[PDB]
Design a protein around this ligand. Structure first.
Ligand code: SF4
Ligand code: F3S
Length: 106
């Protein structure tokens, strides 16, 4: 499975979803997550995220390992999203800012 990590938070561009043949992205107020059981590892979503926030589960940075479990868990409670939407208003301002996990909304 592929995993959405820290730089997605407060950006949430949503270009990722248009690439997904199986529709396994789930939406939060300021973050997206992939469902690990539905994802087929097609990788088609990774070169298309402007925030370079998606990684193969085995290529997820040492300092972001907690996102693997977070994607699995929130994918069970958030609604599916299959259509591209406008990025969050100040996405450029937040793209590249580290430790944005402190800003994650449920
Ligand atoms: S790797 Fe493929 S199946 Fe998994 S979330 Fe990305 S586009 Fe969807
Ligand atoms: S910012 Fe988040 S919404 Fe999709 S396009 Fe990147 S994983």
């Amino acid at each position: 499975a592929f995993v959405v990590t820290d730089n997605c938070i407060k950006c949430k561009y949503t270009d990722c979803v248009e690439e997904c043949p199986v529709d396994c992205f789930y939406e939060g107020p300021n973050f997206l997550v992939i469902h690990p059981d539905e994802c087929i590892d097609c990788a088609l979503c990774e070169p298309e995220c402007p925030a370079q926030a998606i990684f193969s589960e085995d290529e997820v940075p040492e300092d972001m390992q907690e996102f693997i479990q977070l994607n699995a868990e929130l994918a069970e409670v958030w609604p599916n999203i299959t259509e591209k939407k406008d990025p969050l208003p100040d996405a450029e301002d937040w793209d590249g800012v580290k430790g944005k996990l402190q800003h994650l909304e449920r």
